[PDB]
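The following record pairs a protein chain with its ligand, chloride ion.
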Amino acid sequence: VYLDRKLLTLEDKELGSGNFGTVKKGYYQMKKVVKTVAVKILKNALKDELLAEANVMQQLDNPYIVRMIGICEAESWMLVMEMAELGPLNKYLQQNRHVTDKNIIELVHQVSMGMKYLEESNFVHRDLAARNVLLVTQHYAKISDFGLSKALRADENYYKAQTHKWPVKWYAPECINYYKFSSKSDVWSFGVLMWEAFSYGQKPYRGMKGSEVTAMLEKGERMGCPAGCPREMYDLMNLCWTYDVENRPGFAAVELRLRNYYYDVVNHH
Ligand SMILES: CN(C)c1ccc(-c2cc3ncccc3c(NCCCN)n2)cc1
Ligand SMILES: [Cl-]
């Protein structure tokens, strides 16, 4: 949707940055109330990527996915989104070390619900990481950052990339080796995201080059169990890290395992 620039107010507060430009906090006027927003502003191919990112967000409607308000064509191209005011999950857990395991399970289960919907909708995220999980509240997570997302063709269950700056530590072997991105590749990333969440926002494969990560994975080696991570949660991360794409579970199976485990945790102690 095309938004009116006069109805938008930008704050000095920078929420994010990259080659595209920045993300700033703002306020947008709705029919009656005013809405707090996060605005992706482009620096003045880069314009087309923003419109495709808006096109994907327009098509998604789920409680666990950041809602887009619209696009604003003014001093620059802007993508206006509802703000998840607690911000990225990795930074939040680095600053709040006392969040319980039950609370982490709850948040990771919400991400899996959002991804089950994306899988059902036949979109591939291609940038699933804890930095792209945003907190609305300490008990409500949403998936953001659809800049690399693709709508799958009607005849294929994967997107084939033509070019190769990629978040390689979050990518499945088939992505790195064959440039093929499927919902199962997003499951691998989700396993890295789970490790990050139970490691209170620690970076995965710390001190390792992307090429050293690839070699460790090719040898059947994986990151260890995070300190105090429940065994059932670590077993699920390893299942997400199944090398062969055909034996790796899809998001329906991942979400069901997280649902049953979470409702078992809440029913106990
Ligand atoms: C508390 N704090 C430091 C903070 C930082 C970032 C956000 C925030 C919220 C957003 N909400 C909706 C869409 C994008 C959002 C965004 N984006 C950019 C990077 C995300 N990988 N950042 C909020 C608070
Ligand atoms: Cl990386």
